Amino acid sequence: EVETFAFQAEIAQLMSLIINTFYSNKEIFLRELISNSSDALDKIRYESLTDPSKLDSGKELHINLIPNKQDRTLTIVDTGIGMTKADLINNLGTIAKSGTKAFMEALQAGADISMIGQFGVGFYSAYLVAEKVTVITKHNDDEQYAWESSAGGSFTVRTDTGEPMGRGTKVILHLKEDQTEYLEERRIKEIVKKHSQFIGYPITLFVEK
Numbered sequence: 001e002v003e004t005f006a007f008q009a010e011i012a013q014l015m016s017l018i019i020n021t022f023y024s025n026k027e028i029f030l031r032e033l034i035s036n037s038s039d040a041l042d043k044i045r046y047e048s049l050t051d052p053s054k055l056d057s058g059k060e061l062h063i064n065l066i067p068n069k070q071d072r073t074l075t076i077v078d079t080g081i082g083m084t085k086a087d088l089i090n091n092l093g094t095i096a097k098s099g100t101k102a103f104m105e106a107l108q109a110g111a112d113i114s115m116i117g118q119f120g121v122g123f124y125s126a127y128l129v130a131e132k133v134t135v136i137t138k139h140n141d142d143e144q145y146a147w148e149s150s151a152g153g154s155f156t157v158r159t160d161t162g163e164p165m166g167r168g169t170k171v172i173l174h175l176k177e178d179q180t181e182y183l184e185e186r187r188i189k190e191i192v193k194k195h196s197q198f199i200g201y202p203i204t205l206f207v208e209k
């Protein structure tokens, strides 16, 4: 049972700008997604400080990077607070309408796409490298859901029958054919060391057979 939603017009515009603008520095997508994971991990850690049972769904707080060259996917997994269904529908827990407004004014007033995270909409930088993005998520207060979009103005939400997650979020980037450098170990390592060296959670780069 799959529900299809229209993006708000401002978010559709943000996504088309990310997809259509010539902009070579695409690697910042990974920094933005790792920073989102770190923010989600901070949230569940804060909640556990007064309620240890918040970690009954998993005590470990970490980030995994899982490249799969056969599927042409890069998956970013975290065990943060996760998202409810309502969060997913409401722009993946962001204030994306006001964030997009600010970001697009900054762009005409000097800034560049790499600055997107300062506007709270860094998730959408996934579309610098991905033709499709699938988000699997589990929040303590809701069931496991899958969000998905290939842009084009719409996204879907469904209950996820896949492998149960415990708690957290999995961002599956279905990479564009010309963006497969981001599945190579040495490239991913380079980007994490350049842009994510001060993230306060373990980041494990899985290797492939």
Ligand SMILES: Cc1nnc(-c2cccc(Br)c2)o1
Binding pocket: 014, 017, 018, 021, 022, 023, 100, 103, 104, 105, 107, 112, 113, 114, 116, 125, 128
């Ligand atoms: C708003 C807004 N105006 N241009 C952009 C943009 C262009 C290329 C890459 C990225 Br990320 C963002 O965002």
